[PDB]
Amino acid sequence: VFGAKYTLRFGHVLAPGEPYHQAFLKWAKAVEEKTNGDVRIEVFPSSQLGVEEDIIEQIRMGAPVGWNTDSARLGMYVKDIGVMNLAYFIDFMGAKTPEEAIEVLKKIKQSPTMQKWLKELEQRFGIKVLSFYWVQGYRHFVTNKPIRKPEDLNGLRIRTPGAPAWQESIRSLGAIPVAVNFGEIYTAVQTRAVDGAELTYANVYNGGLYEVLKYMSETGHFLLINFEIVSADWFNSLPKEYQKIIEEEMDKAGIEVSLKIMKELEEEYKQKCIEKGMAVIPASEIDKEAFMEKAKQAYKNLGLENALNQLIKEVKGE
Template sequence: MRLKKMTAVILSGLMLLPLTACGSTSQTGSDAASSVEPEIVLDVAFENNSSEPIGAGWERAQEIIKEKSGGKMAIEVYPDSQLGDKSSLIDSMLLGEPVCTLADGAFYADYGIKDMGILFGPFLFDDWDQCWTLIESDWYEDQCKKLEEKGLKIIASNWMYGERHTLTNVPVNSVDDLKGLKIRVPSNEIQSYGFDVLGATSTGMALGDVYQALQTKTIDGAENPIATLYGRKLHEVAPYLILDGHVKNFTTWVVSADWFNSLTEEQQNWLVETAQEAGEYNNQVLQEAEQEYLQLMVDEGVTVVDPSEEVLEGFREKAASFYEMGDRFGWSDGLYDTVRKAMGAEE
């Protein structure tokens, strides 16, 4: 109940901001937009539950794009894998379909932009500021251009997905406790090896299948941000959580490059501005909600381990070998150092 109340307050307060700024003109535009039949409709689909901050972010985006376009563009939202998993959605984009989903560097690596895979490496970022510095860098811009040549256009990179933690059906108090455990990860090479180096046995699986797999003990655990772990109710069948924060997960939203380029410049601007503004909103909701999700998990019987710096150093030491696997991933020479420099990290 506390989470619902808190989220409602956040949503109500944030939704009032643009309306207050625009005054009566905004209301007139809204009335006009409601009578216009949209010329362009984008289907935004994802595996997450609509109750998660991502769902709130795209609800806000529906309002933003309607206001910006005067009702000429619209967004339809399909949570809970209603339109399929991430890979099938990306395949649809490559056919030019008007579909959008969230994806990350690990998936882009599988689609040919090998260097972007490093963005999902374990313990790459020291803090969130490094993420935001990186997405404004020349290196990142170059990677996005290469991705567009492959048929995929990133429209926003400023969405926090959250720090990824590990939920298991047996206690994990240090990296050594992961040895031999089957841990679900998204189905891509980077995240699989990223968890294997920690001593676990990674298992690629669609998010919608994880609850049953944990329930039947097909797997021993799963990793994801707190909002997703709670939103999918995975703690009901895996009651041990270690806050290892192995990936600071900023996520991107991607569409078909061919479809995007078929839009007018004005329509493109409406879409990109909407996605980025909705990202800022998502981040506010997420940051406010995470502690509430965590408390709810504790209240519902989850044992939470907040590891010491010494324990986390053990994770980092294990993770270091991942960055020696560049040849396996097809990375450019010196990629780790290049990316650390682009994010403003001091070595």
């Protein structure tokens, strides 16, 4: 009293106050406005605590919940969609600038193959993708040794997220992948349990990791594409007009924060990291083709090369 008719609780939107959170709050406010207060969206920052959450099982259960997740997770369910979390994916799709990256994502969305995968996620698993135009930016190696070619990673324990798309990718580039809770990366480096990480400049700066790692080597080996999911059962319970408002408003909010991240914020954080004494190995000094060539073996090890090729075909319009 006198509240909304539908309430959505949307979680895992990363750290409080940061760009993603800001953008989800903009999205929520716009859906609320355009639905006349009938849809209320509550936005929950990520916890850094190490607690079990079965986020997909809630989505399957039909709860009024959503999550900021990724294709490394969704690829556990419909295997092939996981190709979008593999090393150099956006480069293999031909994107070489921020604006080009967003345009490729739009082409992937209208692709018959993506539409297939999204229908399988919905029907077989009850997962509705509202958007994947949410990009955290390019990830680079963060180490105490410059990385210019694959051989430089040999023997290096590099922490990367726990799912196979990440682990196999970092392994194929030449490193030993290691899982470590993000909030514990600093501890893992200071206590010498790992040799480095692979992160965005925002992650490195906000974590104060420049205190313990000296080099940012700009391999640009991942572009982190987030997938924004809700229960298919819940989404379908909404009126069609509201279904369209929710999806359109978040594709819009997503495009907006993705470009701000890629065109401005990551640049600012780079400057701040330089000002904290880090040494940047620029992209032009790195054998990126050698890394791209090593990356192909992750696609093969996981069975996702056909998936990539299939996407390449339909996007090469036009």
